[PDB]
Coordinates of C-alpha atoms and ligand atoms in Angstrom, one line a residue:
X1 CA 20.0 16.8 -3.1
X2 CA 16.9 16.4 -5.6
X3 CA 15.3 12.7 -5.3
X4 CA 15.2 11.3 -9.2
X5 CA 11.6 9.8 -10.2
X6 CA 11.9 7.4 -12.8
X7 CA 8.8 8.1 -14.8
X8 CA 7.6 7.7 -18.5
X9 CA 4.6 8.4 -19.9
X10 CA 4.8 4.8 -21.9
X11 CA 6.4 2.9 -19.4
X12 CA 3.4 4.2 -16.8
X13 CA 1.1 2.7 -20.1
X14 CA 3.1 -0.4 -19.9
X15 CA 2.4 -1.0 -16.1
X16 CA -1.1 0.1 -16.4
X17 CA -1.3 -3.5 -18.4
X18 CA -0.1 -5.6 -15.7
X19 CA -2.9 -8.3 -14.7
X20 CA -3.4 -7.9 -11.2
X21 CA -3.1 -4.3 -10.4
X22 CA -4.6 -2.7 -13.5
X23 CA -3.9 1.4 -14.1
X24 CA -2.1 1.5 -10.3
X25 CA 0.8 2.7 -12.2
X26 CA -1.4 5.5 -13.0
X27 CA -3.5 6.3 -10.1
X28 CA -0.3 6.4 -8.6
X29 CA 1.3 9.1 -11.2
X30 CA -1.6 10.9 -11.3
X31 CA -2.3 11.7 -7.7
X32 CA 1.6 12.1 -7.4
X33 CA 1.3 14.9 -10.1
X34 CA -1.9 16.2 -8.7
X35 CA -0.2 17.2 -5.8
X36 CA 2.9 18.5 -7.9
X37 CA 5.1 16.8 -6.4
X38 CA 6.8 15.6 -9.7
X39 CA 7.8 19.2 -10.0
X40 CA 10.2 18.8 -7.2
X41 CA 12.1 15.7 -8.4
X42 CA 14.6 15.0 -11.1
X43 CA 12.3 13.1 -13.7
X44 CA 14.5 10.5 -16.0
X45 CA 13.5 8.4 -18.2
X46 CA 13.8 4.5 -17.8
X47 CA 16.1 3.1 -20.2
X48 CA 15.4 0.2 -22.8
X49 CA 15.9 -3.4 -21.4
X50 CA 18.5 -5.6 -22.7
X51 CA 18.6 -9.2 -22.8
X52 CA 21.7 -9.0 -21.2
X53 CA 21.1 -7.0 -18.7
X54 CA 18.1 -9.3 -17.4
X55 CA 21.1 -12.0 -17.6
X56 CA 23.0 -10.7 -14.8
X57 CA 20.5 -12.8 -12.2
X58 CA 18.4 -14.7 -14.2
X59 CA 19.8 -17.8 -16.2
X60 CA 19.2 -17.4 -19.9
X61 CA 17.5 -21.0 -20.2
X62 CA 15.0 -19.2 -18.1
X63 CA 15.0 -15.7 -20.2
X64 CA 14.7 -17.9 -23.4
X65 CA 11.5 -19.3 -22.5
X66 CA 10.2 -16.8 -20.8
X67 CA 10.5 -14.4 -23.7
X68 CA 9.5 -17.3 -25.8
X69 CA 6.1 -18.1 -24.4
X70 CA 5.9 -14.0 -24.5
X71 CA 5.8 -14.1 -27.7
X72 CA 3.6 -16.7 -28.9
X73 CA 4.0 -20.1 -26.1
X74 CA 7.4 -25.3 -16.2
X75 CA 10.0 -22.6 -14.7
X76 CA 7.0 -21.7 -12.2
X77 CA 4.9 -20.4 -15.3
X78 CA 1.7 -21.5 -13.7
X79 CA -1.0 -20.7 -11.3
X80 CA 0.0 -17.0 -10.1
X81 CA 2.2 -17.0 -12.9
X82 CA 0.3 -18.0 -15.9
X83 CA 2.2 -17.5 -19.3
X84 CA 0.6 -14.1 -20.8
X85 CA 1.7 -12.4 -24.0
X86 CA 4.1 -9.5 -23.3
X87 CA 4.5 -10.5 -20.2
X88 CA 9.0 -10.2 -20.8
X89 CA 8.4 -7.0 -22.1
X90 CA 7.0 -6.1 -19.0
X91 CA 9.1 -7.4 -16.7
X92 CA 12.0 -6.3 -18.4
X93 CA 10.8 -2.8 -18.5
X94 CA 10.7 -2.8 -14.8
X95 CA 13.7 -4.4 -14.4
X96 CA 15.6 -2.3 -16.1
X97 CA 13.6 1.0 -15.0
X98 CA 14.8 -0.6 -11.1
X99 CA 18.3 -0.7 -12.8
X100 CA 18.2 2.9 -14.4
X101 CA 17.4 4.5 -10.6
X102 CA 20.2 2.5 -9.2
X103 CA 22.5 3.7 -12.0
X104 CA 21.5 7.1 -11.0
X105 CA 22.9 6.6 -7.7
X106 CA 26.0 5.6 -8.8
X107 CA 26.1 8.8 -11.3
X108 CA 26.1 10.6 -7.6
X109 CA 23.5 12.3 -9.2
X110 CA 21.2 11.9 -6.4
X111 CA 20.7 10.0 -2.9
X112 CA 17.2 9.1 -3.4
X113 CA 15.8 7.1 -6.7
X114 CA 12.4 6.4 -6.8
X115 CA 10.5 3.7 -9.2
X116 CA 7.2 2.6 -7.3
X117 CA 6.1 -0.1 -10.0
X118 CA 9.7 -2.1 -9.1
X119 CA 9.8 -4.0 -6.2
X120 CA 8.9 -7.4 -7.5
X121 CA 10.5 -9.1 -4.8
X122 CA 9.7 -13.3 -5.6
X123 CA 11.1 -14.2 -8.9
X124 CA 14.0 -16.5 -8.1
X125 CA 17.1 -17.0 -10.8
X126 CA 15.1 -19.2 -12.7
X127 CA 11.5 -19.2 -11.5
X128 CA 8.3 -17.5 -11.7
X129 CA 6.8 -16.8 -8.3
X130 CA 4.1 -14.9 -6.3
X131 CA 2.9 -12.6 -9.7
X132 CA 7.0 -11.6 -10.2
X133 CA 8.5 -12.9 -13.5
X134 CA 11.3 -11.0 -13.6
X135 CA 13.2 -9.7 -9.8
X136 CA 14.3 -6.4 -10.3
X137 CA 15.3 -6.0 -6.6
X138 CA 17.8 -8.6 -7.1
X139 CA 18.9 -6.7 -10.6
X140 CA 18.9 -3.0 -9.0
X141 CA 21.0 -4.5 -6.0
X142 CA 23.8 -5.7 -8.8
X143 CA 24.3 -2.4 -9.9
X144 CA 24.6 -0.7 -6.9
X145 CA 27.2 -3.3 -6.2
X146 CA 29.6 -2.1 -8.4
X147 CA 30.0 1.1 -6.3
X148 CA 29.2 0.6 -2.7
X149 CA 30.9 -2.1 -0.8
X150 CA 28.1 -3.3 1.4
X151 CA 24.0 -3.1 0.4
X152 CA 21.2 -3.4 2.8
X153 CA 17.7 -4.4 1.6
X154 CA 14.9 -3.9 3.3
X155 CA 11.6 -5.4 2.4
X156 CA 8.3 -4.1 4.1
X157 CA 6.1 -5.5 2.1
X158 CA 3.2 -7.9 3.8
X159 CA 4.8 -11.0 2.1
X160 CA 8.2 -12.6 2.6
X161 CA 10.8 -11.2 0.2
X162 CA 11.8 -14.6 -0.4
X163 CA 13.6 -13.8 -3.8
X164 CA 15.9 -11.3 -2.7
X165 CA 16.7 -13.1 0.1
X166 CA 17.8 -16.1 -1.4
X167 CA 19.7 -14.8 -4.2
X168 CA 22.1 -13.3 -1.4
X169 CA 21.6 -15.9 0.9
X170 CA 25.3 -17.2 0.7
X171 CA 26.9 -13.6 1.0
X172 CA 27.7 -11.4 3.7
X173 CA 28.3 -7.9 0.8
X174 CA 24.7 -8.0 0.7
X175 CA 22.0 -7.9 3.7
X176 CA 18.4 -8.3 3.4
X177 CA 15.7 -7.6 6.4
X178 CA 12.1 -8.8 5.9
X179 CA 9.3 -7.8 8.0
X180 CA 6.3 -9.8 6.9
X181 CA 3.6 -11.6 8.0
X182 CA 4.0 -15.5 8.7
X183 CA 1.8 -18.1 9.6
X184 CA 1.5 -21.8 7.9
X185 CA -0.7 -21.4 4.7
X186 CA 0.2 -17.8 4.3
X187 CA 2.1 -16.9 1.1
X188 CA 4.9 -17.6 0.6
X189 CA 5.3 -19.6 3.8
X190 CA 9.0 -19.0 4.1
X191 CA 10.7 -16.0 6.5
X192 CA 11.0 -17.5 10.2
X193 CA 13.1 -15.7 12.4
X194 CA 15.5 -18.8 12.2
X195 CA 15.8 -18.0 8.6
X196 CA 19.2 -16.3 8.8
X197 CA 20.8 -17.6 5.9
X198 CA 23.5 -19.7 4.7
X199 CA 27.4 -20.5 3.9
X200 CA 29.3 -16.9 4.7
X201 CA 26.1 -15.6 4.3
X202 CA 24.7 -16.8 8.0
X203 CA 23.3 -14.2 9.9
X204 CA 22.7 -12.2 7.2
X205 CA 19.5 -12.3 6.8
X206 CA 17.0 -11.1 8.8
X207 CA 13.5 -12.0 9.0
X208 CA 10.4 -10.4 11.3
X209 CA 7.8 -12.9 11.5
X210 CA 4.3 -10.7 12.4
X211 CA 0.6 -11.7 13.0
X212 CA -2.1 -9.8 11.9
X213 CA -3.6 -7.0 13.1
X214 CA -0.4 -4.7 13.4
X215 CA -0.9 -1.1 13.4
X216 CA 1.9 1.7 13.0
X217 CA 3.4 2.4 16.8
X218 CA 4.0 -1.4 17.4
X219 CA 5.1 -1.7 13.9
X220 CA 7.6 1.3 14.5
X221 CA 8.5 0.0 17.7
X222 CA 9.9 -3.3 15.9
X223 CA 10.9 -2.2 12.7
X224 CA 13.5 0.8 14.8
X225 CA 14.5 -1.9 17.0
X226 CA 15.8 -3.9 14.4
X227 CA 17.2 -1.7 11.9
X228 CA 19.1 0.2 14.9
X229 CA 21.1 -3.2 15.2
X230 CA 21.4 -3.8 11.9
X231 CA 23.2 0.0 10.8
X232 CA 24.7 -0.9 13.8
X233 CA 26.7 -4.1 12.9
X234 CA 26.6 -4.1 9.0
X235 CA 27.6 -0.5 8.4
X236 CA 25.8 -0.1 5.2
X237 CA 27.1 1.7 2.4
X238 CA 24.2 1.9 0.4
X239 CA 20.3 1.1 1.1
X240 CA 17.4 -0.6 -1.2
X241 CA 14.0 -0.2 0.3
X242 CA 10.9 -2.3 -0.5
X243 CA 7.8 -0.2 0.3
X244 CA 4.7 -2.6 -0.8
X245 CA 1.6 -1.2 0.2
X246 CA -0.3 -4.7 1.4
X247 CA 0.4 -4.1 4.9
X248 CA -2.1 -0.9 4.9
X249 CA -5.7 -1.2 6.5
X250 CA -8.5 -1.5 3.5
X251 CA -6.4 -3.8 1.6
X252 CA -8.1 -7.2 0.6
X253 CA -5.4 -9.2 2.0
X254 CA -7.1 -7.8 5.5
X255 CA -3.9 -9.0 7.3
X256 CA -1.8 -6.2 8.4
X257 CA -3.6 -3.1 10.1
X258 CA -1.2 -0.1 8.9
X259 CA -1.2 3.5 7.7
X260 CA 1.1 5.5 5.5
X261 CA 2.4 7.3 8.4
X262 CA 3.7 4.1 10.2
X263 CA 5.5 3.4 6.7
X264 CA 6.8 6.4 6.5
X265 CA 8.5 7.1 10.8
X266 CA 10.5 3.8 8.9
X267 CA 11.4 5.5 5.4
X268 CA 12.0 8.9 7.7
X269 CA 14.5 6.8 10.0
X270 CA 16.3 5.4 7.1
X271 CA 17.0 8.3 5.0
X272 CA 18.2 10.2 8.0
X273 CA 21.5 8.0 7.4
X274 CA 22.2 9.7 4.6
X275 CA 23.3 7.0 2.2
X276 CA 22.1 6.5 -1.6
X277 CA 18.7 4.7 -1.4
X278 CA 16.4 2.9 -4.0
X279 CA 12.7 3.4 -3.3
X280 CA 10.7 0.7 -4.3
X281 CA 6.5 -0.1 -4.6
X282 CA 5.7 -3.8 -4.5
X283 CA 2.2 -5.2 -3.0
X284 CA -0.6 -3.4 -2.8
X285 CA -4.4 -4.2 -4.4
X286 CA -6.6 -1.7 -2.9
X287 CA -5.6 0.5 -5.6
X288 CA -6.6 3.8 -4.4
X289 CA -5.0 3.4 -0.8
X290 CA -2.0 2.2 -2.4
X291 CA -1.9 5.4 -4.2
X292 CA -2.4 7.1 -1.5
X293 CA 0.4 5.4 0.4
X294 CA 3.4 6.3 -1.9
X295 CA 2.3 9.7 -2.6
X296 CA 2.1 10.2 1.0
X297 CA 5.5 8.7 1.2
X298 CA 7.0 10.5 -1.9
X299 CA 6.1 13.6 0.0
X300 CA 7.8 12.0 2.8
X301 CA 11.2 11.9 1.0
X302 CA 10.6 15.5 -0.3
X303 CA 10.2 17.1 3.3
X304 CA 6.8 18.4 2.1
X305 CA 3.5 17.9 4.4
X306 CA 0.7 17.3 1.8
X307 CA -3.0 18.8 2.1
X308 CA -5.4 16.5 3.7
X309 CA -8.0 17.1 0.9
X310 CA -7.8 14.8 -2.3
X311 CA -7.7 17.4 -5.5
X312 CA -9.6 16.7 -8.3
X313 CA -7.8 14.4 -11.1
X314 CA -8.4 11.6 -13.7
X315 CA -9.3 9.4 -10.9
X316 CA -10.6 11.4 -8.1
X317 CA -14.4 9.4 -7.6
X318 CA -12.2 5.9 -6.8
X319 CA -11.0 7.9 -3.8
X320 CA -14.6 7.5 -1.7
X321 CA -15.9 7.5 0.6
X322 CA -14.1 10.7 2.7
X323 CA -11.9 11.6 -0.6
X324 CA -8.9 12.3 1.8
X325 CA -5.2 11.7 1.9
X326 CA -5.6 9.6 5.5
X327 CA -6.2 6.3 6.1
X328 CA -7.8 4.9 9.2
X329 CA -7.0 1.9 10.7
X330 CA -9.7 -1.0 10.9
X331 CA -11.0 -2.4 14.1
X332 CA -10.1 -5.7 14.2
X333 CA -7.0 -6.9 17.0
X334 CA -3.8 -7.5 16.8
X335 CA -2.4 -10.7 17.0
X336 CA 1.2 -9.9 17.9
X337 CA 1.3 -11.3 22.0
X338 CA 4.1 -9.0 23.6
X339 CA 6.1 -12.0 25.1
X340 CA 6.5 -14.1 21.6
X341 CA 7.4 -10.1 20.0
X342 CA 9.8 -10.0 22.6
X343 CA 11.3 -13.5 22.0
X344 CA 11.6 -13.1 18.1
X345 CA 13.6 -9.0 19.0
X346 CA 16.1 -11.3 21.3
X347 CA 16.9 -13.7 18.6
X348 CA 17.2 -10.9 16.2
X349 CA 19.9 -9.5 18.7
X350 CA 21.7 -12.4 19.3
X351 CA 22.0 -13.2 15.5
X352 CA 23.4 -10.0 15.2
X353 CA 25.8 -10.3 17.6
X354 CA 27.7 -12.3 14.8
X355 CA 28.1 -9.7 13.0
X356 CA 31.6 -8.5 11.9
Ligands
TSN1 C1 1.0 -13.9 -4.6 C2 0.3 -13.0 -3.6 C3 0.9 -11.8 -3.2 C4 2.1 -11.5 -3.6 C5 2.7 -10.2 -3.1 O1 1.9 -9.3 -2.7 N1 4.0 -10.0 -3.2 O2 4.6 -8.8 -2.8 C6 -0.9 -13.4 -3.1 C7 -1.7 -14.6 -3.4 C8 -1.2 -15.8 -2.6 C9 -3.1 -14.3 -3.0 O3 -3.3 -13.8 -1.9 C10 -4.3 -14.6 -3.9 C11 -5.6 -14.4 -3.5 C12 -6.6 -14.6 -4.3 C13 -6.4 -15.2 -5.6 N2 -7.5 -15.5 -6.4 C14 -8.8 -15.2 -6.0 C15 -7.2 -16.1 -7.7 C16 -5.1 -15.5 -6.0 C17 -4.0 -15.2 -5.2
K2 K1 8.5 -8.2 3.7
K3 K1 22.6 -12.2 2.9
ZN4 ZN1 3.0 -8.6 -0.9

């Protein structure tokens, strides 16, 4: 009944190095240890990435170069996803540290597996997208495949889960539910709520197109809505969960207006049906509050309520101004009109409807 946290002192190291969100791996760890919380879950050790292992979603013309411009150095290696050195190695490690936690839940050695620097949710089959190289979502979901008939993913993330969604878009085993902002421009500009997949994989997917400005009871509201339907008509047998931490208040993408506790009535109404889940991190560039997100969620999963107070640790002065666990919500509106909320929950439930 112990939640296993896939941790590593090098593999933390490793993520530190990522480009865009340097040493959140550790700010992470280290206010998750400094509340001690890492003494109440099964710790395991992420095992070592195979080339083959990668090869079970990604083509291996892609893995060649990929590795190849990795080592020394088209297939979306541009822009957001520039060719840096090590940058397989990284990827990998993730993918297969997404892999080891769903491996765990197959062992039945737990019902909760927890790796917060997975959830790279944009890398397609054989493309770089949207900072992901490597889709370790997609990777994690194929193991759990081998034991549980039917897999649910649920991506809360600010930004479409596009990745995960497509590589299941033609199969009805495997059903993905996105909420995530949308509006033309907006990255990655797919996810409308007529987005519901193809072949025998229509009405399978699930997208929540949102505005800015949400905060956590709306967000509830919809998210409850939603996912009662969809337990409801899928019968799930096992559950992956995207947690990226872009949709909180403070956060530079200054789209979505939520707090760790909206996030977490979600997590709190999944869990409660009782079926093996893979927690996973994603989004998320205001370091500190992103730290403060999934340590307020890991206690979330533990049952524990946390001390407001921020204890001292390695990177206690980035937590100012108020140096507490809380995060207020910003004073800016919300987008989301009632009526067009209400028109995008009806075509949810008529999608669903299909369902068998
Ligand atoms: C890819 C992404 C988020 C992905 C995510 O979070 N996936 O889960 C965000 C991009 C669009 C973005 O917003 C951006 C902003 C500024 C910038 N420069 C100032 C260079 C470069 C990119
Ligand atoms: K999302
Ligand atoms: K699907
Ligand atoms: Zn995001």
């Amino acid at each position: 009944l112990v939640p296993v946290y896939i941790y590593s002192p090098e593999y933390v190291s490793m993520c530190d190095s990522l480009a865009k969100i340097p040493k959140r791996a550790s700010m992470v760890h280290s206010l998750i240890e400094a509340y001690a919380l890492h003494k109440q879950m099964r710790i395991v050790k992420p095992k070592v990435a195979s080339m083959e292992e990668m090869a079970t979603f990604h083509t291996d013309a892609y893995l060649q170069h990929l590795q190849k411009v990795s080592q020394e150095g088209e297939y979306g290696l541009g822009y957001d996803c520039p060719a840096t050195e090590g940058i397989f190695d990284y990827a990998a490690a993730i993918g297969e540290a997404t892999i080891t936690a769903a491996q765990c839940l197959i062992d039945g050695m737990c019902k909760v597996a927890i790796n917060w620097s997975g959830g790279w949710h944009h890398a397609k089959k054989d493309e770089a997208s949207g900072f992901c190289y490597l889709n370790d979502a997609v990777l994690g979901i194929l193991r759990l495949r081998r034991k549980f008939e039917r897999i649910l993913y649920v991506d809360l993330d600010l930004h479409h889960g596009d990745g995960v969604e497509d590589a299941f878009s033609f199969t009805s085993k495997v059903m993905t539910v996105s909420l995530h902002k949308f509006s033309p421009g907006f990255f990655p500009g797919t996810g409308d709520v007529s987005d519901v997949g193809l072949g025998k994989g229509r009405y399978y997917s699930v997208n929540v197109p949102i505005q800015d400005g949400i905060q956590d009871e709306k967000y509830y509201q919809i998210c409850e809505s939603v996912l009662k339907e969809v337990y409801q008509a899928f019968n799930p047998k096992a559950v992956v969960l995207q947690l990226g931490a872009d949709t909180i208040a403070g956060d530079p993408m200054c789209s979505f207006n939520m707090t760790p506790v909206g996030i977490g009535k979600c997590l709190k109404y999944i869990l409660q049906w009782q079926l093996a889940t893979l927690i996973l991190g994603g989004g998320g560039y205001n370091l500190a509050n992103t730290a403060r997100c999934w340590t307020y969620l890991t206690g979330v999963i533990l049952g524990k309520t946390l001390s407001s107070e921020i204890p001292d640790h390695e990177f206690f002065t980035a937590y100012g101004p108020d140096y507490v666990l809380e995060i207020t919500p910003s004073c800016r509106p919300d987008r989301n009109e009632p009526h067009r909320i209400q028109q995008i929950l009806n075509y949810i439930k008529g999608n669903l409807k299909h369902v068998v």
